[PDB]
């Protein structure tokens, strides 16, 4: 069947398989979770340590796309770094022309349209990265948006991407995140990240946590190591 070879092609039943195949790529990558609470958005990534040789605090999967917005990526990392660059360029342009920090909903849309373009043409493959963007602005509020390789963009109160997406969603679902405050959520994100990690299949993980909110004064920033350490302890204790 030659229907799946290209994204230009459409299968007789109407499905563009190459895009679906690209979505399977994200499942290969490790889980990453983002939860939006009233104060702001907290993102967490379980970063597998493949080798002791690799430096800690490197191979980051959480990128700052602009002062007010942060991106967590899952999927082929190379594409993600490139998508992050597209996002940063778009953010700069919105500031340069419209003169203010990009509204996140718009940013998601512009990046999504770029991602969708790859879906239509046959020369370029669909991007293999699924990413989440989050920002807190006093006027806009706290916003978490996730973009699939298809280019579908939607706003999620809580969201997960990666190998354990289904399992994580069940845990995230029992959180009542809207009421919860940002500091409490960081502990909760860690608990979920620890629960989903499979020790047998994956030897070890370093939790990378980032947050944007009133506490960060609307700047996406890596969680201070004191806060991260406290959370990692809370998580191991909860794992029992």
């Amino acid at each position: 069947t030659g229907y799946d070879l290209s994204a230009s092609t459409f299968s007789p039943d109407g499905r563009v398989f190459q895009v679906e195949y690209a979505m399977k790529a994200v499942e290969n990558s490790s889980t990453a979770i983002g939860i939006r609470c009233k104060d702001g958005v907290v993102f967490g990534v379980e970063k597998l340590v493949l080798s002791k040789l690799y430096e800690e605090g490197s191979n980051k999967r959480l990128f700052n796309v602009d002062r007010h917005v942060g991106m967590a990526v899952a999927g082929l990392l190379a594409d993600a770094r490139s998508l992050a660059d597209i996002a940063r360029e778009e953010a700069s342009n919105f500031r340069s022309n419209f003169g203010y920090n990009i509204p996140l909903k718009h940013l998601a849309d512009r990046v999504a349209m770029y991602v969708h373009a790859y879906t239509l043409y046959s020369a370029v493959r669909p991007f293999g990265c699924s990413f989440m963007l989050g920002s807190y602005s006093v006027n806009d509020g706290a916003q978490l948006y996730m973009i699939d390789p298809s280019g579908v963009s939607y706003g999620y109160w809580g969201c997960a991407i990666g190998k354990a997406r289904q399992a994580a969603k069940t845990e995230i679902e029992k959180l009542q995140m809207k009421e919860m405050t940002c500091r409490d959520i960081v502990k909760e994100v860690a608990k979920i990240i620890y629960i989903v990690h499979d020790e047998v299949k994956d030897k070890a993980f370093e939790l990378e946590l980032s947050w944007v909110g009133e506490l960060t004064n609307g700047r996406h920033e890596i969680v201070p190591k004191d806060i991260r350490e406290e959370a990692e302890k809370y998580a191991k204790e909860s794992l029992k």
Binding site: S8, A112, H116, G151
Partner: protein, 239 residues
């Protein structure tokens, strides 16, 4: 075979199979959209299904505003749908800039549809798999409903449907137009909801349906609030 697999190649019987395959994609979404034109109002209703509780309900919509007075419901692949909406919004503004008056709905469908033919004739791109239904009020011709399909066909209809149950939906609507009674705003909305509900057998609650209306009295496209949708839904059940 091999007659399918490229939009450009024509089948030995001249059927351009890839374009037909795209129309199948609209159905793969699993959602249906119904539009009915009243004497003074045009309404578009679509099924809103939220897959996960986590997703914010506000973000998920198939109803978009091309311009202040034109509204569209796009059924098909979600990503392709957003792409067409942007082109429509760009085209709508470009008309105001160049010609100085708001684009007539028919001309927006014509431009959007013509763009689709280019995709159908050029080899590299794939026909976008989405169908857009536009509702607007033209002062000269009153309310207007137009649908553009992935082929580039742009017919305007008194009432139409797109999606999994389109054929069934069309039959229900056809019976209602044949017994013409004209439609007041309430009836136009009621007919739309009854049609979507009957074909899907859903017995809808306010959350599952998104309804958008354009009226001669208030020409601007408005997406009705859940309460407004509930009021019409309650009336349908009461009578």
């Amino acid at each position: 075979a091999g007659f399918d697999r490229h939009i450009t190649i024509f089948s030995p019987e001249g059927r351009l199979y890839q374009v037909e395959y795209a129309f199948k994609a609209i159905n793969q979404g699993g959602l249906t959209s119904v539009a009915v034109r009243g004497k003074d109002c045009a309404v578009i209703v679509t099924q809103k299904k939220v897959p996960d509780k986590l997703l914010d309900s506000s973000t998920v919509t198939h109803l978009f505003k091309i311009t202040e007075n034109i509204g569209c419901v796009m059924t098909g692949m979600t990503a392709d749908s957003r792409s067409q909406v942007q082109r429509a919004r760009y085209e709508a503004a470009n008309w105001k800039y160049k010609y100085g008056y708001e684009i007539p709905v028919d001309m927006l469908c014509k431009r959007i549809a013509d763009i689709s033919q280019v995709y159908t004739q050029n080899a590299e791109m794939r026909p976008l798999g989405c169908c857009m239904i536009l509702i607007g009020i033209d002062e000269e011709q009153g309310p207007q409903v137009y649908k553009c399909d992935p082929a580039g066909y742009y017919c305007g209809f008194k009432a139409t449907a797109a999606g999994v149950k389109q054929t069934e939906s069309t039959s229900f609507l056809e019976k209602k137009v044949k017994k013409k009674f004209d439609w007041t705003f309430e009836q136009t909305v009621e007919t739309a909801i009854t049609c979507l509900s009957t074909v899907l057998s859903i017995d809808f609650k306010p959350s599952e349906i998104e309804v958008g209306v354009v009226t001669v009295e208030n020409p601007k496209f408005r997406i009705l609030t859940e309460a407004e949708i509930d009021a019409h839904l309650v009336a349908l059940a009461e009578r």
